[PDB]
mmCIF file with all atom_site columns, C-alpha atoms and ligand atoms in Angstrom:
data_model
loop_
_atom_site.group_PDB
_atom_site.id
_atom_site.type_symbol
_atom_site.label_atom_id
_atom_site.label_alt_id
_atom_site.label_comp_id
_atom_site.label_asym_id
_atom_site.label_entity_id
_atom_site.label_seq_id
_atom_site.pdbx_PDB_ins_code
_atom_site.Cartn_x
_atom_site.Cartn_y
_atom_site.Cartn_z
_atom_site.occupancy
_atom_site.B_iso_or_equiv
_atom_site.pdbx_formal_charge
_atom_site.auth_seq_id
_atom_site.auth_comp_id
_atom_site.auth_asym_id
_atom_site.auth_atom_id
_atom_site.pdbx_PDB_model_num
ATOM   1   C  CA  . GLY B 1 1   ? 32.030 -210.607 -46.676 1.00 47.75 ? 482  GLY B CA  1
ATOM   2   C  CA  . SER B 1 2   ? 28.287 -210.991 -47.189 1.00 48.24 ? 483  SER B CA  1
ATOM   3   C  CA  . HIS B 1 3   ? 26.439 -207.653 -47.179 1.00 44.26 ? 484  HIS B CA  1
ATOM   4   C  CA  . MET B 1 4   ? 26.972 -205.966 -50.568 1.00 43.14 ? 485  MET B CA  1
ATOM   5   C  CA  . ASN B 1 5   ? 26.358 -209.152 -52.535 1.00 41.11 ? 486  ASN B CA  1
ATOM   6   C  CA  . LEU B 1 6   ? 24.274 -207.455 -55.187 1.00 40.72 ? 487  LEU B CA  1
ATOM   7   C  CA  . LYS B 1 7   ? 24.869 -208.500 -58.781 1.00 44.98 ? 488  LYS B CA  1
ATOM   8   C  CA  . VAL B 1 8   ? 23.744 -205.899 -61.307 1.00 45.80 ? 489  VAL B CA  1
ATOM   9   C  CA  . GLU B 1 9   ? 22.795 -206.701 -64.901 1.00 45.82 ? 490  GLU B CA  1
ATOM   10  C  CA  . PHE B 1 10  ? 21.553 -204.186 -67.436 1.00 48.36 ? 491  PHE B CA  1
ATOM   11  C  CA  . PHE B 1 11  ? 20.413 -203.384 -70.968 1.00 49.87 ? 492  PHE B CA  1
ATOM   12  C  CA  . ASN B 1 12  ? 18.600 -200.636 -72.856 1.00 48.24 ? 493  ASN B CA  1
ATOM   13  C  CA  . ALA B 1 13  ? 15.081 -201.591 -73.987 1.00 52.98 ? 494  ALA B CA  1
ATOM   14  C  CA  . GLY B 1 14  ? 15.304 -198.996 -76.783 1.00 52.41 ? 495  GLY B CA  1
ATOM   15  C  CA  . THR B 1 15  ? 18.554 -198.340 -78.630 1.00 52.61 ? 496  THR B CA  1
ATOM   16  C  CA  . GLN B 1 16  ? 17.708 -195.603 -81.158 1.00 52.14 ? 497  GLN B CA  1
ATOM   17  C  CA  . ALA B 1 17  ? 20.576 -193.075 -81.265 1.00 52.34 ? 498  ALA B CA  1
ATOM   18  C  CA  . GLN B 1 18  ? 18.218 -190.111 -81.629 1.00 52.92 ? 499  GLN B CA  1
ATOM   19  C  CA  . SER B 1 19  ? 15.553 -190.950 -79.086 1.00 51.69 ? 500  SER B CA  1
ATOM   20  C  CA  . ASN B 1 20  ? 13.025 -188.952 -77.097 1.00 50.65 ? 501  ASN B CA  1
ATOM   21  C  CA  . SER B 1 21  ? 13.273 -191.464 -74.260 1.00 51.94 ? 502  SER B CA  1
ATOM   22  C  CA  . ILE B 1 22  ? 15.888 -193.581 -72.505 1.00 51.13 ? 503  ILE B CA  1
ATOM   23  C  CA  . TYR B 1 23  ? 14.843 -197.052 -71.386 1.00 52.66 ? 504  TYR B CA  1
ATOM   24  C  CA  . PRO B 1 24  ? 17.068 -198.450 -68.616 1.00 53.37 ? 505  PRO B CA  1
ATOM   25  C  CA  . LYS B 1 25  ? 16.364 -202.032 -67.528 1.00 55.58 ? 506  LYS B CA  1
ATOM   26  C  CA  . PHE B 1 26  ? 18.193 -203.424 -64.482 1.00 58.47 ? 507  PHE B CA  1
ATOM   27  C  CA  . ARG B 1 27  ? 18.190 -206.917 -63.008 1.00 60.07 ? 508  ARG B CA  1
ATOM   28  C  CA  . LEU B 1 28  ? 19.469 -207.065 -59.439 1.00 63.70 ? 509  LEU B CA  1
ATOM   29  C  CA  . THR B 1 29  ? 20.427 -210.414 -57.914 1.00 62.56 ? 510  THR B CA  1
ATOM   30  C  CA  . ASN B 1 30  ? 21.200 -211.098 -54.266 1.00 59.25 ? 511  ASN B CA  1
ATOM   31  C  CA  . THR B 1 31  ? 24.159 -213.470 -54.612 1.00 58.56 ? 512  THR B CA  1
ATOM   32  C  CA  . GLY B 1 32  ? 24.716 -213.715 -50.858 1.00 58.74 ? 513  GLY B CA  1
ATOM   33  C  CA  . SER B 1 33  ? 23.035 -215.721 -48.107 1.00 57.79 ? 514  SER B CA  1
ATOM   34  C  CA  . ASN B 1 34  ? 21.634 -212.732 -46.211 1.00 56.58 ? 515  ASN B CA  1
ATOM   35  C  CA  . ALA B 1 35  ? 18.617 -210.696 -47.294 1.00 55.61 ? 516  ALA B CA  1
ATOM   36  C  CA  . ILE B 1 36  ? 19.322 -207.262 -48.774 1.00 57.14 ? 517  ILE B CA  1
ATOM   37  C  CA  . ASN B 1 37  ? 17.275 -204.247 -47.684 1.00 54.76 ? 518  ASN B CA  1
ATOM   38  C  CA  . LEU B 1 38  ? 16.203 -202.556 -50.914 1.00 57.09 ? 519  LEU B CA  1
ATOM   39  C  CA  . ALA B 1 39  ? 15.461 -199.208 -49.252 1.00 57.95 ? 520  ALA B CA  1
ATOM   40  C  CA  . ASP B 1 40  ? 19.222 -198.662 -48.920 1.00 56.26 ? 521  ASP B CA  1
ATOM   41  C  CA  . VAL B 1 41  ? 19.901 -199.425 -52.576 1.00 56.20 ? 522  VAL B CA  1
ATOM   42  C  CA  . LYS B 1 42  ? 20.469 -196.796 -55.320 1.00 54.77 ? 523  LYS B CA  1
ATOM   43  C  CA  . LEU B 1 43  ? 21.272 -197.157 -59.044 1.00 52.99 ? 524  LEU B CA  1
ATOM   44  C  CA  . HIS B 1 44  ? 22.930 -194.678 -61.448 1.00 56.88 ? 525  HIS B CA  1
ATOM   45  C  CA  . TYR B 1 45  ? 22.611 -194.340 -65.207 1.00 54.55 ? 526  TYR B CA  1
ATOM   46  C  CA  . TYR B 1 46  ? 25.102 -191.798 -66.653 1.00 52.29 ? 527  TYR B CA  1
ATOM   47  C  CA  . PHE B 1 47  ? 24.503 -189.817 -69.845 1.00 51.34 ? 528  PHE B CA  1
ATOM   48  C  CA  . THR B 1 48  ? 24.896 -186.519 -71.689 1.00 52.18 ? 529  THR B CA  1
ATOM   49  C  CA  . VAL B 1 49  ? 21.554 -184.706 -71.669 1.00 52.19 ? 530  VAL B CA  1
ATOM   50  C  CA  . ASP B 1 50  ? 21.908 -183.104 -75.148 1.00 49.84 ? 531  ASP B CA  1
ATOM   51  C  CA  . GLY B 1 51  ? 19.865 -180.063 -74.218 1.00 51.28 ? 532  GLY B CA  1
ATOM   52  C  CA  . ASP B 1 52  ? 19.050 -179.797 -70.532 1.00 51.18 ? 533  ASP B CA  1
ATOM   53  C  CA  . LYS B 1 53  ? 15.327 -179.835 -69.676 1.00 50.12 ? 534  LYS B CA  1
ATOM   54  C  CA  . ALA B 1 54  ? 13.384 -180.929 -66.593 1.00 51.96 ? 535  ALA B CA  1
ATOM   55  C  CA  . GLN B 1 55  ? 13.275 -184.724 -66.786 1.00 50.01 ? 536  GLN B CA  1
ATOM   56  C  CA  . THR B 1 56  ? 10.976 -187.359 -65.333 1.00 47.95 ? 537  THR B CA  1
ATOM   57  C  CA  . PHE B 1 57  ? 11.643 -191.022 -64.559 1.00 48.52 ? 538  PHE B CA  1
ATOM   58  C  CA  . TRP B 1 58  ? 8.805  -193.567 -64.504 1.00 52.90 ? 539  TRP B CA  1
ATOM   59  C  CA  . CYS B 1 59  ? 9.189  -197.083 -63.202 1.00 53.19 ? 540  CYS B CA  1
ATOM   60  C  CA  . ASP B 1 60  ? 6.862  -199.085 -65.399 1.00 54.02 ? 541  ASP B CA  1
ATOM   61  C  CA  . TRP B 1 61  ? 7.460  -202.416 -63.692 1.00 55.39 ? 542  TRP B CA  1
ATOM   62  C  CA  . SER B 1 62  ? 9.287  -203.969 -60.778 1.00 56.42 ? 543  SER B CA  1
ATOM   63  C  CA  . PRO B 1 63  ? 8.191  -207.011 -58.741 1.00 57.64 ? 544  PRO B CA  1
ATOM   64  C  CA  . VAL B 1 64  ? 8.652  -204.826 -55.648 1.00 56.75 ? 545  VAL B CA  1
ATOM   65  C  CA  . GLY B 1 65  ? 5.972  -202.436 -56.897 1.00 57.01 ? 546  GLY B CA  1
ATOM   66  C  CA  . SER B 1 66  ? 6.656  -199.662 -59.369 1.00 56.94 ? 547  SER B CA  1
ATOM   67  C  CA  . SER B 1 67  ? 5.356  -196.968 -57.013 1.00 55.94 ? 548  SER B CA  1
ATOM   68  C  CA  . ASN B 1 68  ? 8.178  -197.915 -54.648 1.00 53.91 ? 549  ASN B CA  1
ATOM   69  C  CA  . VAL B 1 69  ? 10.828 -197.106 -57.238 1.00 55.72 ? 550  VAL B CA  1
ATOM   70  C  CA  . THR B 1 70  ? 11.588 -193.458 -58.016 1.00 54.97 ? 551  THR B CA  1
ATOM   71  C  CA  . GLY B 1 71  ? 14.143 -191.464 -59.977 1.00 52.73 ? 552  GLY B CA  1
ATOM   72  C  CA  . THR B 1 72  ? 15.863 -188.099 -59.687 1.00 53.36 ? 553  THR B CA  1
ATOM   73  C  CA  . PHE B 1 73  ? 18.364 -186.365 -61.966 1.00 57.97 ? 554  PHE B CA  1
ATOM   74  C  CA  . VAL B 1 74  ? 21.682 -184.918 -60.843 1.00 60.22 ? 555  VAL B CA  1
ATOM   75  C  CA  . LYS B 1 75  ? 24.321 -182.999 -62.758 1.00 59.12 ? 556  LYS B CA  1
ATOM   76  C  CA  . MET B 1 76  ? 27.810 -184.484 -62.991 1.00 60.63 ? 557  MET B CA  1
ATOM   77  C  CA  . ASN B 1 77  ? 30.340 -182.055 -61.546 1.00 58.00 ? 558  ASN B CA  1
ATOM   78  C  CA  . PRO B 1 78  ? 32.680 -181.697 -63.225 1.00 60.18 ? 559  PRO B CA  1
ATOM   79  C  CA  . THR B 1 79  ? 31.191 -183.146 -66.362 1.00 63.51 ? 560  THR B CA  1
ATOM   80  C  CA  . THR B 1 80  ? 33.190 -185.823 -68.108 1.00 62.83 ? 561  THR B CA  1
ATOM   81  C  CA  . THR B 1 81  ? 33.280 -187.970 -71.215 1.00 63.53 ? 562  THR B CA  1
ATOM   82  C  CA  . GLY B 1 82  ? 29.838 -189.450 -71.805 1.00 61.99 ? 563  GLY B CA  1
ATOM   83  C  CA  . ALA B 1 83  ? 28.407 -187.987 -68.628 1.00 60.76 ? 564  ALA B CA  1
ATOM   84  C  CA  . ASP B 1 84  ? 27.042 -184.578 -67.760 1.00 60.53 ? 565  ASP B CA  1
ATOM   85  C  CA  . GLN B 1 85  ? 24.138 -186.005 -65.725 1.00 59.07 ? 566  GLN B CA  1
ATOM   86  C  CA  . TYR B 1 86  ? 22.909 -189.123 -64.029 1.00 59.09 ? 567  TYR B CA  1
ATOM   87  C  CA  . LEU B 1 87  ? 19.591 -190.683 -63.196 1.00 60.76 ? 568  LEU B CA  1
ATOM   88  C  CA  . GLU B 1 88  ? 19.559 -191.949 -59.618 1.00 64.90 ? 569  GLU B CA  1
ATOM   89  C  CA  . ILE B 1 89  ? 16.968 -194.643 -58.888 1.00 66.16 ? 570  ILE B CA  1
ATOM   90  C  CA  . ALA B 1 90  ? 15.905 -195.184 -55.256 1.00 65.78 ? 571  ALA B CA  1
ATOM   91  C  CA  . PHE B 1 91  ? 13.611 -197.671 -53.489 1.00 66.61 ? 572  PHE B CA  1
ATOM   92  C  CA  . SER B 1 92  ? 11.137 -196.806 -50.732 1.00 66.92 ? 573  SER B CA  1
ATOM   93  C  CA  . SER B 1 93  ? 10.902 -198.872 -47.528 1.00 65.92 ? 574  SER B CA  1
ATOM   94  C  CA  . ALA B 1 94  ? 7.772  -200.533 -48.913 1.00 66.98 ? 575  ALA B CA  1
ATOM   95  C  CA  . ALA B 1 95  ? 9.973  -202.144 -51.607 1.00 65.18 ? 576  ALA B CA  1
ATOM   96  C  CA  . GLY B 1 96  ? 11.012 -204.594 -48.879 1.00 64.23 ? 577  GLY B CA  1
ATOM   97  C  CA  . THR B 1 97  ? 13.916 -207.047 -48.906 1.00 64.17 ? 578  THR B CA  1
ATOM   98  C  CA  . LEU B 1 98  ? 15.594 -209.031 -51.683 1.00 61.64 ? 579  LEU B CA  1
ATOM   99  C  CA  . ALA B 1 99  ? 15.993 -212.657 -50.612 1.00 57.35 ? 580  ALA B CA  1
ATOM   100 C  CA  . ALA B 1 100 ? 19.207 -214.651 -50.865 1.00 58.13 ? 581  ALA B CA  1
ATOM   101 C  CA  . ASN B 1 101 ? 19.702 -216.055 -54.375 1.00 60.16 ? 582  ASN B CA  1
ATOM   102 C  CA  . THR B 1 102 ? 16.720 -214.199 -55.853 1.00 58.43 ? 583  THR B CA  1
ATOM   103 C  CA  . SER B 1 103 ? 16.506 -211.399 -58.407 1.00 56.22 ? 584  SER B CA  1
ATOM   104 C  CA  . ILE B 1 104 ? 14.174 -208.558 -59.304 1.00 57.55 ? 585  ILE B CA  1
ATOM   105 C  CA  . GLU B 1 105 ? 13.914 -206.425 -62.405 1.00 58.80 ? 586  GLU B CA  1
ATOM   106 C  CA  . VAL B 1 106 ? 13.624 -202.648 -62.412 1.00 57.38 ? 587  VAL B CA  1
ATOM   107 C  CA  . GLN B 1 107 ? 12.318 -201.401 -65.742 1.00 60.13 ? 588  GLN B CA  1
ATOM   108 C  CA  . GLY B 1 108 ? 11.919 -197.700 -66.366 1.00 61.28 ? 589  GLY B CA  1
ATOM   109 C  CA  . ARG B 1 109 ? 11.953 -194.835 -68.847 1.00 63.19 ? 590  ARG B CA  1
ATOM   110 C  CA  . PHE B 1 110 ? 12.853 -191.202 -68.668 1.00 63.35 ? 591  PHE B CA  1
ATOM   111 C  CA  . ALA B 1 111 ? 12.219 -188.219 -70.919 1.00 65.73 ? 592  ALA B CA  1
ATOM   112 C  CA  . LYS B 1 112 ? 12.385 -184.450 -71.069 1.00 64.54 ? 593  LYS B CA  1
ATOM   113 C  CA  . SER B 1 113 ? 9.428  -182.232 -70.220 1.00 62.40 ? 594  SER B CA  1
ATOM   114 C  CA  . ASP B 1 114 ? 9.122  -181.048 -73.833 1.00 61.70 ? 595  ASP B CA  1
ATOM   115 C  CA  . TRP B 1 115 ? 9.779  -184.529 -75.247 1.00 59.66 ? 596  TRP B CA  1
ATOM   116 C  CA  . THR B 1 116 ? 12.751 -183.308 -77.277 1.00 61.40 ? 597  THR B CA  1
ATOM   117 C  CA  . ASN B 1 117 ? 15.538 -185.696 -78.268 1.00 64.47 ? 598  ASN B CA  1
ATOM   118 C  CA  . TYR B 1 118 ? 18.517 -187.277 -76.579 1.00 65.28 ? 599  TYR B CA  1
ATOM   119 C  CA  . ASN B 1 119 ? 21.524 -188.639 -78.449 1.00 63.10 ? 600  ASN B CA  1
ATOM   120 C  CA  . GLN B 1 120 ? 22.080 -192.001 -76.748 1.00 65.20 ? 601  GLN B CA  1
ATOM   121 C  CA  . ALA B 1 121 ? 25.217 -192.890 -78.711 1.00 65.46 ? 602  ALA B CA  1
ATOM   122 C  CA  . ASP B 1 122 ? 27.617 -190.830 -76.563 1.00 63.60 ? 603  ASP B CA  1
ATOM   123 C  CA  . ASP B 1 123 ? 26.109 -191.819 -73.181 1.00 64.41 ? 604  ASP B CA  1
ATOM   124 C  CA  . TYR B 1 124 ? 28.492 -193.412 -70.673 1.00 62.48 ? 605  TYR B CA  1
ATOM   125 C  CA  . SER B 1 125 ? 25.959 -196.036 -69.527 1.00 63.84 ? 606  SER B CA  1
ATOM   126 C  CA  . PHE B 1 126 ? 24.347 -196.710 -72.931 1.00 64.73 ? 607  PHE B CA  1
ATOM   127 C  CA  . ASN B 1 127 ? 24.718 -200.218 -74.303 1.00 61.27 ? 608  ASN B CA  1
ATOM   128 C  CA  . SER B 1 128 ? 23.965 -200.136 -78.012 1.00 60.11 ? 609  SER B CA  1
ATOM   129 C  CA  . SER B 1 129 ? 24.486 -203.879 -78.475 1.00 57.38 ? 610  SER B CA  1
ATOM   130 C  CA  . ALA B 1 130 ? 22.812 -205.838 -75.661 1.00 57.95 ? 611  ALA B CA  1
ATOM   131 C  CA  . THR B 1 131 ? 19.318 -207.234 -76.281 1.00 58.40 ? 612  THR B CA  1
ATOM   132 C  CA  . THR B 1 132 ? 18.979 -208.718 -72.821 1.00 58.25 ? 613  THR B CA  1
ATOM   133 C  CA  . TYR B 1 133 ? 20.495 -208.506 -69.355 1.00 58.50 ? 614  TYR B CA  1
ATOM   134 C  CA  . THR B 1 134 ? 24.278 -208.300 -69.346 1.00 59.71 ? 615  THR B CA  1
ATOM   135 C  CA  . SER B 1 135 ? 26.990 -207.721 -66.735 1.00 60.97 ? 616  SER B CA  1
ATOM   136 C  CA  . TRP B 1 136 ? 27.564 -204.024 -67.273 1.00 60.09 ? 617  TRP B CA  1
ATOM   137 C  CA  . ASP B 1 137 ? 30.106 -202.002 -65.295 1.00 60.18 ? 618  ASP B CA  1
ATOM   138 C  CA  . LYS B 1 138 ? 29.059 -198.675 -66.818 1.00 60.72 ? 619  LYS B CA  1
ATOM   139 C  CA  . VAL B 1 139 ? 26.013 -198.435 -64.581 1.00 58.55 ? 620  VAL B CA  1
ATOM   140 C  CA  . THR B 1 140 ? 26.579 -198.278 -60.844 1.00 59.87 ? 621  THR B CA  1
ATOM   141 C  CA  . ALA B 1 141 ? 24.770 -199.372 -57.689 1.00 62.15 ? 622  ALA B CA  1
ATOM   142 C  CA  . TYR B 1 142 ? 25.043 -198.289 -54.048 1.00 64.13 ? 623  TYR B CA  1
ATOM   143 C  CA  . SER B 1 143 ? 24.083 -199.519 -50.622 1.00 62.22 ? 624  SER B CA  1
ATOM   144 C  CA  . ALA B 1 144 ? 24.020 -197.495 -47.403 1.00 65.41 ? 625  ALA B CA  1
ATOM   145 C  CA  . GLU B 1 145 ? 27.778 -198.088 -47.412 1.00 64.12 ? 626  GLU B CA  1
ATOM   146 C  CA  . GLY B 1 146 ? 28.392 -196.431 -50.775 1.00 62.58 ? 627  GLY B CA  1
ATOM   147 C  CA  . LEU B 1 147 ? 29.374 -197.819 -54.178 1.00 62.62 ? 628  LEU B CA  1
ATOM   148 C  CA  . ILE B 1 148 ? 28.855 -201.589 -54.537 1.00 67.43 ? 629  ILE B CA  1
ATOM   149 C  CA  . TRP B 1 149 ? 28.875 -202.104 -58.318 1.00 66.44 ? 630  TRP B CA  1
ATOM   150 C  CA  . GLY B 1 150 ? 30.410 -200.574 -61.408 1.00 72.90 ? 631  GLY B CA  1
ATOM   151 C  CA  . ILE B 1 151 ? 32.761 -197.770 -62.406 1.00 71.20 ? 632  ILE B CA  1
ATOM   152 C  CA  . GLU B 1 152 ? 31.731 -194.160 -61.849 1.00 69.03 ? 633  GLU B CA  1
ATOM   153 C  CA  . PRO B 1 153 ? 32.774 -191.856 -64.720 1.00 65.74 ? 634  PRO B CA  1
HETATM 154 CA CA1 . CA  X 2 .   ? 23.721 -188.076 -74.948 1.00 66.66 ? 1229 CA  X CA1 1
HETATM 155 NI NI1 . NI  X 3 .   ? 30.328 -208.203 -47.397 1.00 68.69 ? 1230 NI  X NI1 1
#
């Protein structure tokens, strides 16, 4: 109809296989005519942790205000190919609405508490090739209604 009209594009800002950080960059576009409430929107980035440690997500930039964008880490259960964990990005109510036919970027990083390495190469959501925003079905997005973009592992 016209309520989950959220286009999701993605790329990795850093593509080193052995990397102490992962650098997800999303661009979300409201392709409908009705405004989208960002507070109900979640994003997932799926990966293998390569040595589990407490992790932190920082949103460095988003037009909606980086402090309104936060991340938590959840274990996949059961684990599967390319995915034993996911980052889940959420928006606060202060993030506001995304207008019809407008887009916002969500640029962030995450790392382990001890700054030890990931191997990005085997990560479900990792795009080793893209150097700018691409239509990527290996990250997912959600509204209040559930999945609205992508293929869960
Ligand atoms: Ca990995
Ligand atoms: Ni709809």
